[PDB]
Ligand binder design. Structure first.
Ligand SMILES: COc1ccc(Br)cc1S(=O)(=O)Nc1cc2c(C)noc2cc1C
Ligand code: NA
Length: 127
């Protein structure tokens, strides 16, 4: 099999803006997760060829990863924080759907998600 094209990170036609919440999502939330020991499987799109996962994109039709999120935040791709939060949720959910409870990778996703939710509790109010 082949890999699909990765998710877009800019789109002229998609409404986009900067908000202080989205700034916080990049500067604090993404940065804290990116540097965590458990970040490595989630720092780029799943490469189903190199990782030998020929069923991955048979099961997962809405892929998402932190590399894509980082680029989207750097490009001010989002209209609001909720759109960015939804991308993180998709990334975690995909891991839980494709794998099994207790799997090494699921336990890592669960730890990152816990940290994510802690950091998102301190999301400042919007301007
Ligand atoms: C067998 O490959 C493993 C085993 C344990 C861990 Br933790 C990670 C891998 S892997 O080489 O990153 N392959 C892999 C990646 C993902 C991603 C991303 N989402 O679900 C996955 C499942 C596997 C096996
Ligand atoms: Na599952």
């Amino acid at each position: 099999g082949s890999n699909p094209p990765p998710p877009e990170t800019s789109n002229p036609n998609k409404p986009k803006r900067q908000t202080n919440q989205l700034q916080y999502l990049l500067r604090v939330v993404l940065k804290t997760l990116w540097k965590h020991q458990f970040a490595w499987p989630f720092q780029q799109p799943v490469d189903a060829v190199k990782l030998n996962l020929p069923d991955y994109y048979k099961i997962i039709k809405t892929p998402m990863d932190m590399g894509t999120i980082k680029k989207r935040l750097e490009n001010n791709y989002y209209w609001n924080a909720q759109e960015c939060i939804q991308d993180f949720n998709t990334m975690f959910t995909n891991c839980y759907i494709y794998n099994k409870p207790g799997d090494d990778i699921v336990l890592m996703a669960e730890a990152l998600e816990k940290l994510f939710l802690q950091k998102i509790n301190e999301l400042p109010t919007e301007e």
